[PDB]
Curated annotation (Swiss-Prot), chain A:
TFIIE is a tetramer of two alpha (TFA1) and two beta (TFA2) subunits. Transmembrane segments: none annotated. The chain holds residues 275 to 306 of 482 of the full protein. Recruits TFIIH to the initiation complex and stimulates the RNA polymerase II C-terminal domain kinase and DNA-dependent ATPase activities of TFIIH. Both TFIIH and TFIIE are required for promoter clearance by RNA polymerase. The lineage of its organism: Eukaryota, Fungi, Dikarya, Ascomycota, Saccharomycotina. Belongs to the TFIIE alpha subunit family. Residues 1-21 are annotated as: Disordered. Present with 35900 molecules/cell in log phase SD medium. This is Transcription initiation factor IIE subunit alpha. It comes from Saccharomyces cerevisiae (strain ATCC 204508 / S288c) (Baker's yeast). Residues 1-12 have a biased composition (Basic and acidic residues).
Swiss-Prot record, chain D:
GO terms for molecular function: ATPase activator activity; double-stranded DNA binding. This is General transcription and DNA repair factor IIH subunit TFB2. The lineage of its organism: Eukaryota, Fungi, Dikarya, Ascomycota, Saccharomycotina. It comes from Saccharomyces cerevisiae (strain ATCC 204508 / S288c). It comes from the Eukaryota. It is found in: Nucleus.
From Swiss-Prot, chain E:
The lineage of its organism: Eukaryota, Fungi, Dikarya, Ascomycota, Saccharomycotina. It comes from the Eukaryota. ATP-dependent 5'-3' DNA helicase. Component of the general transcription and DNA repair factor IIH (TFIIH) core complex, which is involved in general and transcription-coupled nucleotide excision repair (NER) of damaged DNA and, when complexed to TFIIK, in RNA transcription by RNA polymerase II. In NER, TFIIH acts by opening DNA around the lesion to allow the excision of the damaged oligonucleotide and its replacement by a new DNA fragment. The ATP-dependent helicase activity of XPD/RAD3 is required for DNA opening. In transcription, TFIIH has an essential role in transcription initiation. Disruption phenotype: Essential, it cannot be deleted. Present with 14400 molecules/cell in log phase SD medium. Belongs to the helicase family. RAD3/XPD subfamily. It is found in: Nucleus. It comes from Saccharomyces cerevisiae (strain ATCC 204508 / S288c) (Baker's yeast). Coiled coil: none annotated. This is General transcription and DNA repair factor IIH helicase subunit XPD/RAD3.
Swiss-Prot record, chain F:
Present with 2340 molecules/cell in log phase SD medium. The gene is SSL1. GO terms for cellular component: nucleotide-excision repair factor 3 complex; transcription factor TFIIH core complex; transcription factor TFIIH holo complex. Component of the general transcription and DNA repair factor IIH (TFIIH) core complex, which is involved in general and transcription-coupled nucleotide excision repair (NER) of damaged DNA and, when complexed to TFIIK, in RNA transcription by RNA polymerase II. In NER, TFIIH acts by opening DNA around the lesion to allow the excision of the damaged oligonucleotide and its replacement by a new DNA fragment. In transcription, TFIIH has an essential role in transcription initiation. Its main location: nucleus. Component of the 7-subunit TFIIH core complex composed of XPB/SSL2, XPD/RAD3, SSL1, TFB1, TFB2, TFB4 and TFB5, which is active in NER. The core complex associates with the 3-subunit CTD-kinase module TFIIK composed of CCL1, KIN28 and TFB3 to form the 10-subunit holoenzyme (holo-TFIIH) active in transcription. An additionnal subunit, TFB6, plays a role in the dissociation of the SSL2 helicase from TFIIH after transcription initiation. The chain holds residues 96 to 459 of 461 of the full protein. This is General transcription and DNA repair factor IIH subunit SSL1. It comes from Saccharomyces cerevisiae (strain ATCC 204508 / S288c).
């Protein structure tokens, strides 16, 4: 189970951010 | 349900579930084949090595000396974790791993005591493997073919390596160790659980294998299904009539019905549609009006009744008269089940006020018909036999 | 949603209609079927502009594809009707005249075995051809059989007919069968309809046949899942014995050849593959039920 | 929306006029084909039987699964008035239109047809050499005029008048030119079938006083006619219409006999690839197309640079995109054209990209994007640039004596949806020019 | 280094030893391991007891790995004197005889793998010096050595071996060997007629 | 020449098909499908990996097997960690085996294979099988080595004594023990050990195993098996099923005990009687009277008609005549029908049409 957990953590470490998943043009512009 | 309260013999219950018993037995009754366990053990300051009970058992089987030391020391002096930590640091593990022992480094004082004992086991194992060999691959006879052969002795490249002092460097010992390990593994396979002529022959030069499959010719003949012929003159006249009608002209507008058979046709078509629609409207278990508590009880009574029916037929159609008494016992059990089925209907009838009794009876109609039919056949055959 | 191919199989034989007309009071009922089919085929061609039509007639000495006519004209229908309908109807009737002329010449020939099975197999081959040639077309088989005429033996027809069912089930080609005659049930054809999501219809009177075709046999493959079929009869999927000719609910089958047998064959030898059964093994079946003494 | 557009037009026709439209079987045969498959099944049942069937019997035919379709079919069938609902004896009896019923029966049974399908002279001609070229060129000539590419011959005033009077190809005399509109680009995107219906559908609405029924008797009858055949001579209104149809590349005339064309049959039902192109990150275009249609349409929003016999190469530029956008073409339409006309190689790699995306993480199903995402974003970003400056027309209200009045007038504008901006602190708000008069009237009252 | 641990996972390791009886038992174990599918690897000496009569037809031999040219110990007084005698008497060059002596042993081991024509095996000569000894190999072996295989890498050798083993596992077409590689009685008569 | 190249190659492909005789085959089969799930199956020679492709093809094989063998039974075994793991008992339900195979698809294969463990498990699973059934074992072996606890040769001798038949599909190369197992267990025949050469050949190998294997002349087990044909009944209210004990709308009624069963073909849960429809028997008749192959007609002679007898496909005139005739009825057929008449249908329309 630990190795499976480590593999899951390894996959998470490699996952790209959310903003890369979808084109964030329609959403409100970044800022404070 | 079928053994505790019903009273069905335990032996009879397992007669129809042999494959389930056999499958479960073989799952725990099988063992993995032999393999070089110590080769997989890599030490990998701190070094972390992981062990498992399966490997621990494998080490004992592949090496009796380890079991000899393990059995007499773990309960006496120190706990098992120290032992395996002690064993690995010892030179015995290095020697058993087929690695040259170094006088520079010493391992465990306790384990090294068994080094001389291993030298005794190896000699005992050498005789355990020594046996006459076929002359085909008898390498001893090749060198003994000429007992008086005397030429030029081979150079040092053709002889085992030696040190400055002239004694063996010890690299040959590990070669024998791996050779012994392989020989033991193969011998372990051949446990309690003419030929030369065939091998020397060249198979490719022999006649090719010929298939010996059987041919079948199927004759075809059978009787017709079991629960006024026009003459040639009539055919010609009738054939002439259709030709004249067709050649002259073809009528299409006459196909319209008279409106009297169309209504009958529509009623007949809708008559079938309603029957099909009724069946098609109700053609994971389906939702049931019965309460969960009652439904679960009905399934229990259905399952137990079916189990009794299954056993009854096996003995009824067995063909051996030695099981007549068992049939009577099962027949009595079937009678009790019928009473239990009737009692449940009465209990549901009064408890639910006939609201669920009609629904409950339908759910058990097919089994009830089978049960009463089974008893009828038993009685009918019993009547003829006895009287 | 997609075009569908209709392959009508018509079983025309001089013996079949001669008995039908003699027992009944309908003369030239074959024309009634043909004209009703012409309208039905025109109706099918009107349901969609991309649907084709295939007609196969099982005559005395074989089968022939009435439509489409082979590459190898009289006025039998009015020329004022629709061009596309006429282009199919005029050729259909013209080939009918040729087909009757050939049959009349060989009237004396003794045709003992019907060719209904052959036509269905030929139509399936045509269905396979058309399906693969154009790629995105459905299919549907319609059998117009006159069962009034007494048949000699349908035993041999069992294997070819049941085999066509599996092929139709592989290509998703529902086959519908309409029988006009005396017997209400046809154990083989009825199984064909049920086993292929088809419809079986039995009608005594030929008049008003178009109503049957337009309401019952007009169900296209596109809307089968949403329409309840009008079939009324229930099939049992049974087979006759090999030496008694009666339907068997429980019986014996030879393992080697898989031939049904109501009782133990005489001589302890199979009558189909000449296979001898072990006396001890058969004795097990012969054993009577166990009863207390 | 092929049948929907045609069906929608038929619904607006008065029931009295719809009855006349069903007199000719030729039209009935086409109106029968346009209905859903389930609807067609019921129509064929009622046509040949002279009886009344309750609606409940119809419901029995449909399975529970297809109940929803039975609602659309009955609603669509009832909307056209083809299905007449009669209620008597406490039952809602259902019957078909007698004229439609009679018309269908005559055609199917081969009865008298009143020459709805025409006649035959047996003077067949070669279609591929002349008919295909003539109509394709004639249909291409109007497209080149629509696309704006130069071409010597211009379409006749009859169609030209229709185009300007229609939303298609907006024109201005002051500009002195013709340009495509948002719907115009959609028109070019629609398949040939719908591409022909749109112009015809506009023609149906354009015509005024030529009877409305006569025009439908001709257009529907045209589909019945078969290409490569002769037909003698027809209604008086149809004669000028026949000449009018000759301008649309639908019917070919030698100068007594008129010959339909391939497009005539294409109107009834439907029927490496040419036009497929590759898009790179460098905004380059490589179209594996040899045809003026693909080249002409691509030039709308692409700056072509060179061409070969088998392919055409170009580069997307801000100027070309700006020129296309200035004409009213939305970026969504542009990407739709590229996505639906993508080369198989792009689709295969795009499928691999989706497979790779799912292979690494099969939890999510990302959209299958054939072209690189950057191009879509940049094209959308260029659209945002055009929409940067936003300006309205109207009047500004200020100098309010009391806040209550300011809130009352401002609230009133919001209710009627003519308020564009307000500020409580300054007691000022702005309203659209359209709502100026309404606000002023409310202020007085 | 740890190479053996990896080899042990796939096949049993048997090694030739100076003792004759121990070596004979190893052959018995090696043959038993190959017959039962366990798989075994035998390490021997080209100039040893195994190479002088032990056969590995079919299963007991499927690949021959010649680790280097079995060159004799050149710095040997007995050998050096022998070379001088041949050079002076039989006019045989020292290098030619040494290469001939080494090759006669390398080829000796190569021929102990094929019995009949249904037998197959891959022979690899692992030494940079074998690249120029193709002309010295036996004719029936040299003919089978292609010009592309004269100098291969380990990775390239594995790919070819895998392809060859896969190809040899297919059912041979009888017609391809009816009378071109195997002769029946009728074919033999035909050959005696054409020759005569 | 390119088209002619296909014809000459087609003739060579037809050369093997010329020799067809009605050999006796065992229709009643009891197959035990064994799969290898070891470290050696993690390679990428088959995309994505051997384990994935083998499982995918196994699902297809199950569908085809039960399609053409309705009255047979199947059992699934896998090799893992040097042990044989049972995942599906012998049963006639195609869905249960498919569901079990789907679950196996998730877990990663590891460990070494053990033929003896798999063979011993298969030996026990086939013990409770009637003598009229043909006991067969299909093994998908990928490893080049086998680790077993006992002597494999003893197991091979036992298998022969039990009249079991073993077919092995290899991935890389021939294993001596596998060849002996497939040869000693098939009365000396050497054609039951197949090694694939590519992905495409594997599909054919799986498809070949669907058809029943011919029986040997000296192996006689002829007997009569008691079967029953239940009558389908339609009920207004759901009732408990005798096989799964759950509420179902309707089920077939056994003619010997009237007990209801959800689906066929299955052994009756009460009288242990096999319930099969007449159609199921009809699915195997083509193996007893196979349709004779068609022989192409030389272009030298004159042909009968320009259009195909069965599909009305105009014969391409163009060299070699694209026509094949049936010896029994002597009717020309196009190339297309012959493939469809020998793969989909099994009856020649020309022979049926001819009256007698
Ligand atoms: Zn038999
Ligand atoms: Zn059930
Ligand atoms: Zn039963
Ligand atoms: Zn054909
Ligand atoms: Zn034939």
């Amino acid at each position: 189970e630990l190795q499976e957990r480590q593999a899951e953590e390894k996959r998470k470490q490699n996952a790209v951010p959310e903003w890369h998943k979808q084109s964030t043009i329609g959403k409100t512009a970044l800022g404070r | 349900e079928t053994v505790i309260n019903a009273g069905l013999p335990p032996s009879e219950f397992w007669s129809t579930r042999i494959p389930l018993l056999r499958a479960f037995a073989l799952s725990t009754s099988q063992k993995v084949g032999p393999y070089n366990v110590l080769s997989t053990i890599k030490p990998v300051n701190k070094v972390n090595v992981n062990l498992s009970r399966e490997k621990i058992l494998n080490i004992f089987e592949n090496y009796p000396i380890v079991k000899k030391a393990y059995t007499d020391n773990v309960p006496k002096n120190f706990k098992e974790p120290e032992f395996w930590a002690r064993f690995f640091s010892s030179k015995l593990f290095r020697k058993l791993r087929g690695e040259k022992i170094m006088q520079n480094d010493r391992g465990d004082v306790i384990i090294d005591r068994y080094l001389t004992l291993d030298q005794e086991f190896d000699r005992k194992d050498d005789d355990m493997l020594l046996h006459p060999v076929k002359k085909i691959i008898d390498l001893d006879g090749n060198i003994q073919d000429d007992p008086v052969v005397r030429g030029n002795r081979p150079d040092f490249t053709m002889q085992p390596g030696v040190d400055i002092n002239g004694n063996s460097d010890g690299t040959v010992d590990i070669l024998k160790g791996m050779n012994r390990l392989s020989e033991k593994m193969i011998m372990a396979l051949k446990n309690e659980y003419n030929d030369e002529r065939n091998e020397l022959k060249i198979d490719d030069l022999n006649e090719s294998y010929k298939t010996n499959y059987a041919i079948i010719h199927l004759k075809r003949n059978a009787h017709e299904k079991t629960t006024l012929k026009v003459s040639n003159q009539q055919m010609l006249q009738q054939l002439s009539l259709v030709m004249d009608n067709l050649i002259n002209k073809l009528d299409l507008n006459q196909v319209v019905p008279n409106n009297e058979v169309s209504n009958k046709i529509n009623k007949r078509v809708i008559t079938a549609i309603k029957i099909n629609a009724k069946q098609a409207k109700h053609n994971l278990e389906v939702k049931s009006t019965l309460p969960i508590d009652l439904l679960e009880s009905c399934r229990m009574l259905h399952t137990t009744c079916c189990e009794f029916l299954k056993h009854f037929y096996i003995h009824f159609q067995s063909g051996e008269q030695k099981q007549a008494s068992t049939v009577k016992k099962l027949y009595n059990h079937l009678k009790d089940c019928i009473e239990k089925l009737n009692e449940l209907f009465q209990d549901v009838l009064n408890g639910d006020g006939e609201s669920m009794s009609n629904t409950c009876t339908a759910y058990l109609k097919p089994v009830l018909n089978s049960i009463t039919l089974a008893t009828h056949k038993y009685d009918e055959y019993f009547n003829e036999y006895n009287n | 949603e997609s075009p569908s191919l209709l392959t009508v199989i018509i079983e025309i034989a001089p013996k079949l209609w001669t008995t039908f007309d003699e027992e009944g009071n309908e003369k030239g009922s074959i024309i009634k079927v043909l004209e009703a089919l012409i309208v039905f085929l025109n109706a099918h061609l009107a349901f969609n502009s991309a649907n084709k039509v295939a007609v196969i007639a099982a005559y005395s000495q074989g089968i022939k594809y009435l439509y489409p006519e082979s590459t190898s004209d009289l006025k039998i229908i009015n020329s004022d009707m629709y061009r596309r309908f006429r282009n199919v109807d005029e050729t259909l009737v013209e080939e009918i005249y040729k087909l009757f002329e050939l049959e009349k010449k060989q009237i004396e020939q003794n045709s003992q075995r019907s060719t209904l099975a052959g036509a269905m197999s030929a139509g399936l081959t045509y269905v396979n051809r058309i399906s693969k040639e154009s790629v995105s077309l459905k299919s549907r088989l319609l059998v117009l059989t006159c069962g009034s005429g007494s048949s000699k033996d349908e035993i041999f027809q069992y294997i070819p007919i049941m085999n066509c069912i599996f092929s139709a089930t592989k290509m998703k080609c529902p086959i519908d069968v309409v029988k006009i005659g005396g017997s209400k049930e046809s154990t083989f054809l009825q199984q064909t309809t049920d086993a292929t999501n088809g419809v079986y219809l039995h009608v005594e009177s030929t008049e008003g046949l178009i109503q049957y075709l337009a309401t019952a046999m007009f169900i296209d493959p596109s809307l089968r899942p949403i329409i309840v079929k009008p079939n009324h009869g229930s099939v049992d999927f049974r087979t006759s014995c090999y030496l008694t000719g009666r339907v068997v609910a429980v019986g014996f089958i030879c393992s080697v050849c898989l031939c049904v047998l109501s009782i133990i064959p005489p001589g302890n030898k199979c009558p189909a593959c000449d296979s001898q059964f072990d006396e001890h093994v058969i004795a097990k079946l012969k054993r009577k039920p166990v009863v207390p003494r | 929306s092929l049948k929907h557009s045609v069906t929608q037009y038929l619904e607006e026709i008065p029931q009295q006029v719809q009855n006349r439209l069903y007199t000719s079987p030729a039209t009935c045969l086409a109106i029968y084909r346009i209905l859903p498959p389930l609807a067609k099944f019921f129509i064929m049942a009622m046509v040949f039987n002279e009886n009344e069937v309750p609606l409940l019997d119809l419901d029995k035919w449909v399975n529970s699964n297809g109940k929803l379709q039975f609602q659309n079919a009955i609603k669509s069938m009832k909307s056209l008035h083809l299905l007449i609902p009669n209620k008597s004896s406490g039952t809602l009896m259902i019957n078909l239109n007698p004229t439609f019923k009679i018309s269908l029966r005559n055609a199917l049974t081969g009865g008298e047809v009143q020459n709805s399908f025409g006649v035959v002279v047996e003077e067949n001609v070669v279609s591929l050499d002349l008919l295909d070229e003539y109509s394709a060129n004639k249909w291409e000539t109007i497209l080149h005029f629509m696309v704006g590419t130069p071409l010597a011959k211009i379409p006749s005033e009859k169609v030209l008048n229709l185009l300007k009077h229609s939303k298609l190809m907006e024109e201005v005399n002051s500009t002195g030119e013709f340009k495509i509109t948002n719907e115009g680009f959609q028109f070019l995107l629609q398949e040939i079938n719908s591409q022909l219906w749109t112009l015809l559908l506009q023609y149906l609405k354009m015509i005024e006083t030529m009877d409305l029924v006569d025009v439908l008797h001709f257009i529907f009858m045209l589909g019945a006619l078969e290409v490569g055949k002769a037909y003698k001579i027809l209604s008086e209104t149809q004669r000028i219409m026949l000449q009018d149809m000759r301008d649309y590349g639908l019917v070919f005339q030698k100068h007594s006999i008129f010959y339909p064309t391939k497009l005539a049959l294409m109107l009834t039902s439907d029927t490496i690839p040419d036009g497929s192109l590759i898009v790179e990150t460098n905004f380059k275009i490589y179209s594996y197309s040899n045809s003026p249609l693909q080249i002409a349409v691509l030039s709308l929003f692409v700056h072509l640079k060179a061409r070969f016999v088998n392919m055409v190469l170009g580069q997307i530029t801000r100027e070309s995109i700006r020129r296309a956008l200035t004409n009213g073409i939305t970026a969504d339409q542009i990407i739709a054209y590229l996505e639906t006309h993508a080369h198989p190689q792009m689709r295969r790699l795009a499928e691999e990209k989706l497979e790779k995306k799912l292979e690494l993480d099969p939890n999510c199903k990302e959209p299958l994007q054939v072209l690189p995402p950057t191009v879509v974003d940049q094209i959308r970003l260029w659209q945002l640039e055009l929409d940067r400056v936003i300006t309205y027309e109207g009047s500004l209200y200020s100098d309010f004596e009391t806040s209550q009045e300011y809130n009352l007038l401002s609230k009133y504008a919001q209710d009627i949806g003519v308020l564009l901006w307000k500020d409580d602190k300054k007691k000022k708000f702005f309203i659209s020019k359209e709502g100026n008069s309404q606000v002023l009237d409310f202020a007085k009252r | 280094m740890g190479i053996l641990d990896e080899v042990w996972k796939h096949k049993l390791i048997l090694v030739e030893t100076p003792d004759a009886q121990e070596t004979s038992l190893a052959l018995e174990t090696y043959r038993k391991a190959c017959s039962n599918g366990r798989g075994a690897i035998l390490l021997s000496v080209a100039r040893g007891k195994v190479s002088e009569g032990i056969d590995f037809d079919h299963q007991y031999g499927r690949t021959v790995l010649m680790i280097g040219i079995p060159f004799q110990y050149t710095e040997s007084r007995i050998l050096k004197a022998r070379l001088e005698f041949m050079r002076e008497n039989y006019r045989i060059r020292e290098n030619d005889f040494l290469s001939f002596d080494a090759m006669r042993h390398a080829a000796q081991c190569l021929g102990r793998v094929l019995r009949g024509k249904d037998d197959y095996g891959v022979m690899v000569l692992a030494d940079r010096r074998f690249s120029r000894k193709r002309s010295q190999l036996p004719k029936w072996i040299a003919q089978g050595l292609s010009d592309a295989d004269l100098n291969l890498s380990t990775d390239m050798a594995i790919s070819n071996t895998k392809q060859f083993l896969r190809t040899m596992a297919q059912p041979t077409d009888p017609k391809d060997q009816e009378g071109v590689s195997v002769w029946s009685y009728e074919d033999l008569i035909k050959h005696q007629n054409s020759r005569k | 020449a390119s088209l002619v190249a296909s014809i000459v190659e087609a003739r060579k492909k037809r050369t093997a098909k010329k020799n067809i005789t009605p050999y006796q085959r065992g229709i009643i089969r009891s197959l035990i499908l064994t799969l290898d799930c070891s470290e050696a199956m993690l390679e990428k020679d088959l995309r994505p990996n051997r384990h994935a492709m083998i499982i995918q093809y196994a699902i297809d094989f199950v569908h085809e097997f039960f399609d053409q063998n309705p009255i047979s039974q199947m059992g699934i075994i896998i090799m893992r960690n040097g042990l044989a793991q049972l995942v599906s008992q012998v049963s006639g339900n195609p869905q249960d085996h498919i569901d079990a195979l789907k679950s196996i698809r998730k877990q990663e294969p590891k460990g070494n294979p053990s033929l003896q463990n798999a063979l011993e498990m298969a030996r026990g699973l086939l013990l409770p099988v009637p003598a009229h059934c043909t006991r067969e074992v299909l093994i998908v072996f990928g490893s080049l080595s086998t680790t077993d606890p006992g002597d494999i040769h003893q197991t091979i001798d036992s298998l022969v004594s039990e009249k079991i038949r073993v077919k092995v599909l290899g991935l890389s190369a021939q294993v001596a023990i596998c060849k002996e197992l497939c040869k000693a267990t098939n009365y000396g025949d050497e054609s039951f050990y197949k090694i694939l050469l590519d992905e495409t050949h594997l599909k054919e190998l799986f498809n070949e195993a669907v058809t029943p294997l011919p029986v040997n002349k000296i192996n006689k087990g002829f007997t009569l098996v008691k079967m029953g044909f239940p009558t389908r009944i339609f009920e207004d209210t759901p009732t408990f099923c005798s096989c799964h004990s759950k509420l179902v709308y309707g089920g077939y009624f056994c003619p010997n005990c009237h007990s209801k069963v959800c689906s066929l073909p299955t052994v009756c849960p009460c009288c242990d009687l096999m319930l099969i429809l007449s159609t199921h028997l009809a699915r195997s008749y083509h193996h007893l009277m196979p349709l004779k192959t068609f022989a192409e007609v030389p272009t030298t002679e004159k042909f009968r008609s320009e259009d195909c007898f069965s599909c009305q496909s105009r014969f391409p005139i163009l060299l070699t005549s694209s026509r094949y005739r049936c010896e029994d009825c002597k009717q020309e057929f196009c190339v297309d029908c012959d493939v469809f008449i020998h793969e989909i249908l099994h009856n020649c329309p020309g022979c049926e049409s001819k009256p007698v």
